[PDB]
Amino acid sequence: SPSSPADWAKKLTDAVLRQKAGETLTAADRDFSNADFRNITFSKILPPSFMERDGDIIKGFNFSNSKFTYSDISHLHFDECRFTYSTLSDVVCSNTKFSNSDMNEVFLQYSITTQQQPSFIDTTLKNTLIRHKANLSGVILNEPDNSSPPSVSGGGNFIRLGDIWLQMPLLWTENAVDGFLNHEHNNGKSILMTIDSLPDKYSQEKVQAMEDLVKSLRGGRLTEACIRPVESSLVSVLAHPPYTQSALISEWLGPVQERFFAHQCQTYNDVPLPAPDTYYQQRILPVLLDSFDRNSAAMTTHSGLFNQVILHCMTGVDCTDGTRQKAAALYEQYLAHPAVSPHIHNGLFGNYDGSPDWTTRAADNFLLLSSQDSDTAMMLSTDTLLTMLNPTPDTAWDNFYLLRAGENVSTAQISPVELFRHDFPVFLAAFNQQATQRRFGELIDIILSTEEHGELNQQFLAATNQKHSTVKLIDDASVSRLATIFDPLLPEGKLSPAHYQHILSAYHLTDATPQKQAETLFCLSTAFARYSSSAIFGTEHDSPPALRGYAEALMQKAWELSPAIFPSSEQFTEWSDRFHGLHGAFTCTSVVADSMQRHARKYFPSVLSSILPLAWA
């Protein structure tokens, strides 16, 4: 006795149902101390107004020392509330909002199943254990005491974020690194982003918390391979002030940033960078500038990467003016480099004086160096350079002035694609990939009825234009869409042969060989796996069913052809499962999609690059 949460749920319901009906609840009426809420799905016992944007709030309630555990307060918004001494461990709080509240001495280690990320506005979290991924842009920090780091049955030591406790791992496994540091693999959710989110004013409680973390890494062993998956994630946050002014963070970052750069010069010097989204534009471009700044040699001997980085800094819509200025500056270097000097001509380049005219994109503002003959060069304008980089169905190529070295050299006898060959590898890749993005483009239309589901027919194509998609297709209106779209494309489980017939022809290869045919639509499966995984159309624990159906359909119809190309009879079964839930329900299909593609780039990798959007490679 007394009774279950089923009691308190009903009690709460009315309290707010009346609170919203106008009644200014007595304090006694809204005192819910020691309230049992475990396994309560508030979504099922409150009106929808309480979990929508506009928002009905839960104001003035006192849940001091209460139990939510396996509870679900996702999308709810608590205001002027006291949780002090309450546990919230294993609570699914997808996008929950706590404001003007007292959440002190609470155990806020919410369920990993949480999607969005809880946020705390003008709320205190004194001596409380939180997961290292809350939105704390409105959190109140007060000088810490001493007390005791909780703890319980978990893992490693604790560090303070002001008066907030955060729990380190027991040991930096590859998985530890991922859940903690890799916000790029987890829709912007890492311990990095978390402590970086505090108001630009708590700037020593932060630098502190980083330094502390950084230590627990310095104290870990972390082979140059543990940190490779996150070189970017890390450098996205700590290669910026206020962290640039530690000594630790600054010193520890050193190698990591160098490794970052080098890796980029290898990967993207002969190859197009996916048109930078708003994060890349704000957190990566600055860093590449810094690295080019500190390595003036690279500006020339990685002309490929450099130019790209500049164009993008100066075209990106979300680029801090600082970036735009530093990028303009660094180009002035380049443009005065003795390797480049000769190619620049007053009355020809940029503003006819010797610099670019950054005021009009029609201006011949770029001079790329050849990767073979340092004395041959291409001059072209911001507009044409953007389209040659991330092309379009009908993007012209023959649209530049060749310089050697010496004035304009006549085209109309030069095959631009044989020019890109060794002189300008970037465009080769762009042109080459544009050809492969067209066939796969056809399939997208064969299955999303040209202009019916025309909204989704485009959402799908847009996702192929870089590694991470901010938009996700998992709801109720969204799950219905695709199950009505793929269901008929696969009568009773497998691959409708009248559709295997479509995709026979529309990849310019009906009859060839089962060994190649298997590899072909295997890749197509690792393509649709990627579609349904995290980082694209699903979150780390919720992948579109139908997209996993179509994906499983494809590798099943790859097993009958040449199963000898696969890894094992264990793997097909191991994978073909996953697409259905016999195997947990987390790390998404980001394992299936990642591993299937990994077993491609080895054993038969030529086919991976002909179907697989460049951005997903």
Resolution of the experimental model, in Å, one decimal: 2.8
Radius of gyration of the chain (CA): 28
Token pair recorded at residue 615? 């951005």
Q: How far apart are CA 225 and CA 555, in angstroms?
A: 31
Contact 132, 197 (CB under 8 A): no
Query: Would you give the DSSP letter of residue 275?
Result: P
Reading phi first (left if > 0) and then psi (alpha if -120 to 50, else beta), residue 613 is in beta
Q: How far apart are CA 160 and CA 277, in angstroms?
A: 33
Is the dihedral angle over the CA atoms 212, 213, 214, 217 positive or is it negative?
A: positive
> Phi and psi for 67 in degrees, rounded to 5?
-125, 105
- In this structure, the number of other CB atoms found within 10 A of the CB of residue 321 comes to 7
Q: How far apart are CA 1 and CA 20, in angstroms?
A: 30
Q: Which of 311, 260, 267 is nearest to 429 (CA)?
A: 267
Reading phi first (left if > 0) and then psi (alpha if -120 to 50, else beta), residue 188 is in left
Q: Which of 401, 445, 437 is nearest to 419 (CA)?
A: 401
Reading phi first (left if > 0) and then psi (alpha if -120 to 50, else beta), residue 457 is in alpha
* Residue type, position 81, single letter: C
Q: Show the domains of the chain with their CATH numbers.
A: 1-169 (2.160.20.80), 170-349 (1.25.40.300), 350-424 (3.40.1850.10), 425-617 (1.10.4140.10)
Whether 588 is a known active-site residue: answer yes
Q: How far apart are CA 197 and CA 241, in angstroms?
A: 13
Strand 119-124: give its sheet, edge to edge. Answer: 58-59, 77-79, 97-99, 119-124, 135-140
- Tally of residues, the chain: 617
Q: How far apart are CA 249 and CA 239, in angstroms?
A: 9
Token pair recorded at residue 504? 């026979």
Selected catalytic residue, list 81, 265, 523, 588: 588
Q: How far apart are CA 452 and CA 455, in angstroms?
A: 8
Burial letters for 295-310: b for 16+ Cβ neighbours within 10 Å, e otherwise? eeebbbebbbbbbbbb
Contact 334, 300 (CB under 8 A): yes
Q: How far apart are CA 8 and CA 32, in angstroms?
A: 8
Pairing relationship of beta strands 401-403 and 377-380 according to DSSP bridges: antiparallel
Q: Which of 517, 502, 393 is nearest to 446 (CA)?
A: 502
Token pair recorded at residue 331? 């180009």
> Phi and psi for 307 in degrees, rounded to 5?
-45, -55
Q: How far apart are CA 132 and CA 610, in angstroms?
A: 40
In terms of C-beta distances under 8 Å and separation of at least 24 residues, what long-range contacts does 498-505 make, across chains too? 499/446, 499/447, 500/557, 502/446, 503/443, 503/446
By what method was this entry solved?
X-ray
Q: Which of 296, 282, 194 is nearest to 240 (CA)?
A: 282
